Amino acid sequence: IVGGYTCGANTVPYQVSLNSGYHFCGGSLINSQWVVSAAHCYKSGIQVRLGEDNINVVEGNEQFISASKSIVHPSYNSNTLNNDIMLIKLKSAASLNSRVASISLPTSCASAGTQCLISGWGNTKSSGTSYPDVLKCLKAPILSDSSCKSAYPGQITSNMFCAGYLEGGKDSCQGDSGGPVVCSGKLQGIVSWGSGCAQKNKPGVYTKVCNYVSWIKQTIASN
Numbered sequence: 481i482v483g484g485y486t487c488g489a490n491t492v493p494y495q496v497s498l499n500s501g502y503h504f505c506g507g508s509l510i511n512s513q514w515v516v517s518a519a520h521c522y523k524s525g526i527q528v529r530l531g532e533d534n535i536n537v538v539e540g541n542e543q544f545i546s547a548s549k550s551i552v553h554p555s556y557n558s559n560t561l562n563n564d565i566m567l568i569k570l571k572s573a574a575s576l577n578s579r580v581a582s583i584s585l586p587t588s589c590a591s592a593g594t595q596c597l598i599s600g601w602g603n604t605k606s607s608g609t610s611y612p613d614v615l616k617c618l619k620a621p622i623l624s625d626s627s628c629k630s631a632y633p634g635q636i637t638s639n640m641f642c643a644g645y646l647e648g649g650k651d652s653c654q655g656d657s658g659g660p661v662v663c664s665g666k667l668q669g670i671v672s673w674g675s676g677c678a679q680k681n682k683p684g685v686y687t688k689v690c691n692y693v694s695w696i697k698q699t700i701a702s703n
């Protein structure tokens with residue numbers, strides 16, 4: 481996250497870190513046994529790390545649970561990033577409390593102008609690199625679909641939205657991938673892609689989760 485603030489330990493209790501020997505992607509807990517992330521975060525051998533603030537320090541609220549199954553969206557296209565969403569089932573159910581808590585799925589798509597919280601452990605610099613060890617947070621509005629299509633000509637599908645600031649300085653970034661965009665207490669987006677980070681007229685692009693709610697519900701009902 482570029483131009484954000486330190487969230488505070490366990491103040492984003494649905495935030496997960498996907499670890500394969502190192503943090504590589506964020507994610508969101510949607511019930512005690514399922515995580516949703518970006519399909520471009522797909523990998524074999526994922527351990528899901530819950531209750532995290534400092535990812536390099538064991539601080540006492542963590543639950544490390546291995547993944548038993550990953551399901552990438554059946555129409556994921558890695559070239560266009562259309563349908564960049566994946567579900568991960570945990571081997572055992574997480575233990576839920578004020579510090580590890582699931583986030584609700586939306587019943588409605590969020591509108592342009594809605595303020596949201598984006599969070600993750602990704603890079604904090606737009607030019608160059610510095611990875612935080614603690615969770616960073618950013619408040620950003622959902623941008624109108626016309627300004628989103630004007631920033632990314634011929635690349636925005638109906639399964640994507642832009643969020644952020646057309647004049648740059650504040651944005652999600654590498655390592656924030658698969659992490660949450662929560663608006664009014666509902667998961668609305670997944671950190672998906674963008675042209676660099678915090679660049680002028682190149683805002684973050686996010687997978688539009690309200691389009692996927694019935695695929696998520698069906699898939700967790702049968703797996």
Ligand SMILES: NCCCc1ccccc1
Pocket residue numbers: 651652653654655656657671672673674675676677678682683684685
């Ligand atoms: N410009 C938006 C943030 C771009 C970023 C998100 C996810 C992965 C890599 C970069």
Ligand SMILES: [Ca+2]
Pocket residue numbers: 532533534535536537538539542
């Ligand atoms: Ca830790």
